[PDB]
Subunit: 250 residues, 4 copies
């Protein structure tokens, strides 16, 4: 068990990428709380992985600052001290910077940026100085690395997460908090969200997009998260982890 | 005159970096509108560079979305079609991610991020398809590249500006808008803000910080902006320009 | 066993980083050939990890092009088809670009650059199209990311390894070779070489160097290589993996 | 005259990119020595820009270490102390890492890497501590940033130049040598070399390659070199300058 004794919060954990991360975390012996906006989906999501001795659903909107403090108390009350925060909750808008409304601009940043900030900030306050091998894993993207002309606000959010985590990682390092902070940069990953977008996977699978000629699967992101959640990565902080089938290598 | 016929809006243009950018722009034959929050500082700032045939002050808070539209109308009414937007307005908070209040978080992002978004978006809408050699120059930072443990929210903002601008450049490139978008990444620059911070220049001048052993001067940032504003840089877009005395090279 | 059925060649595998990589690889069920220049060191290195059913020493200088072919034949004869090449062999010279003799320049590049090229090229030729989950792992450095004023030729080499590997990954991806190529970028790692350098660990442990306040240990590099060698990382190619205690994050 | 009093050596200066750099340098008032392997081409190249009071051809192979010392003596004897070295000489091979012969591997690195090293090293020794506003400009590439599956050895060379220059820049900075070192990263630039390759510009102009939909012209690289050669860039060292029509921004 590579995550023995670990206690993790995975936001957006009821579907797609966060679901697999949750799945593999429990598999490696961690206790897990997954968050989502819908109780029915969330409960069934948690149950699909295991019983309440290893995983629980908690309804939480990642942009809900007050809820974050509650989320931590509930998790600790369930499983004990939190060791791992995976800020995975995120939304995407398909708009150019030119075509981005302010309502869209602020809605997306509310989840993608403020949510990652709330979880990082709270995670540091709660996990520092307890010798937990604590780990904050902030879900950025390939869109944190390069631009996409139709993902303006998303790019801003993922680029914001990338460098902020470095800020967080340095602080924790310098203050011996025993908290690492890192970013994971998924390329295109096959999720039900992508399967809803007609022709999207086909677009993403083009060699000019993803060199390997296919997009990834949620477990590809899950395994890199396990590495970063485990003490195997005790010397890695402030770094970006790219799993994109070669998207950003060209 | 390398900026002949250019018409520029320089936000935060009444002091430090934006002041010199304005100064050199007029020197190269551009017409310039500078923005600031204080009229007494702003008017005198404009007068120190030239008369109203080449430069004007406009009171505007860069986080003021509605004001951005007024700013464009006033500039075009004064000088004709805008060819150059310099998103330079920005504030800094000296707090770790851990110690960052949400008010500080939102105040800083409102100027540093929303303001760059407002000016980029409006700038694209207003400058596209007019064959102006149009140029959007977004002021990021060395803090868009690496972390600083006491600049959490600032890192987030400058990282957001870095990758969003890339989004913007691609769209403009792909759509033949004749608008380039680029980022400038100043290192430590001697400004009245820095001279107000006791011992700050001395900290920034340490070789572990700035290899050259001194910090820069506003004209150092001014000249790279001129390059980016002129048609000498017609093939440069979506790229980052670093002037930091070697800060990020180590 | 995360490396079940894997067959690996670890160059420079008799000491420090390559030693632990070899150690953990066998631990995860891989068969391993380690290379070195000295038989007494090498044989004992192999014996310390296991018997000849799981690990063997082979005397080979990584700059030895002809030897590379012998190395592959011996490994396959011993263990079957090679699935994993770890280009880890490398030397360092403590000279500025200014003070670098051409002999030092060429000696270092012969091991650090030519050796990684020889092993990548041969590895691709030998491992492609066999459905092995084949993985080339090229040992770069933090010195592939940023400069060091007293490591001129080393920077050149590690920067060469970083971008060449990307070339390699794309080709393998685009041609469906089933070979991934990635780079690992160790920061300062406690090795017998470092313990031989008086005061070196102390210099590397300074917060201006390594934020965490200590340097790493060979197992820190070992575990990221395992990740990259296993099918957990099947969607990762052309990417850089940084384990440096935060060195490059500031 | 932005290059008043400057004395520059431009290798590969008889054609394409180096030719324009030479052209614009003289235009900005610098004295220039251009190098090439053919006397007839070189002489006519120099004459096309001006008389021997402002530019001279010198036959030199950039991989010729001994010749470098001669090149410096001849230039200084002609125009006085050298202030600017532009390492622009370079060759490309269209081979994958897999398909790269060692003869090709070593030939390309001999010009692209050893040549840049010889010029950087010699430039530092000769230009330091003379208050010349000295500038070393090393021609890397977009291929110093991302991989290309058919430019294996080229990628290695341009990635090597990128990080080595940082090494050089840090050293000069830390030692107050008054020498900056920087890299320029051309994307696709229309040269007679490209015009010789059938369908190449058409390939390079595809939106999936260069967002702007066309490739650049030698003067695009020329102007960024002028900036870096002038004292306008006195605070820029160890940085990469990307002029690629958006190639690397996606
Ligand atoms: Mg750094
Ligand atoms: Mg790319």
């Amino acid at each position: 068990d590579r995550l023995k004794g670990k206690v993790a919060i995975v936001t957006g954990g009821t579907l797609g990428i966060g679901l697999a991360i949750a799945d593999k975390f429990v598999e490696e012996g961690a206790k897990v709380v997954i968050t989502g906006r819908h109780a029915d989906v969330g409960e069934k999501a948690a149950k699909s992985i295991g019983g309440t001795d290893v995983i629980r659903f908690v309804q939480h909107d990642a942009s809900d600052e007050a809820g974050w403090t509650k989320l931590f108390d509930t998790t600790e009350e369930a499983f004990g001290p939190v060791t791992t925060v995976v800020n995975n909750a995120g939304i995407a808008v398909s708009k150019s910077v030119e075509d981005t409304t302010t309502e869209e601009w602020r809605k997306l940043l509310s989840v993608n940026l403020d949510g990652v900030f709330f979880g990082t900030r709270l995670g540091i306050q709660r996990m520092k100085n307890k010798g937990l091998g604590a780990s904050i894993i902030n879900m950025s993207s390939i869109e944190g690395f390069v631009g996409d002309p139709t993902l303006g606000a998303y790019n801003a959010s993922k680029g914001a997460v990338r460098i902020m985590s470095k800020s967080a990682a340095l602080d924790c390092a310098l203050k011996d908090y025993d908290v690492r902070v890192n970013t994971v940069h998924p390329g295109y990953i096959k999720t039900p969200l992508v399967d809803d977008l007609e022709g999207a996977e086909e677009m993403m699978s083009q060699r000019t997009k993803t060199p390997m000629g296919h997009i990834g699967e949620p477990n590809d992101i899950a395994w890199i998260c396990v590495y970063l959640a485990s003490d195997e990565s005790k010397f890695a902080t402030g770094a970006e982890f790219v799993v994109d089938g070669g998207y950003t290598a060209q």
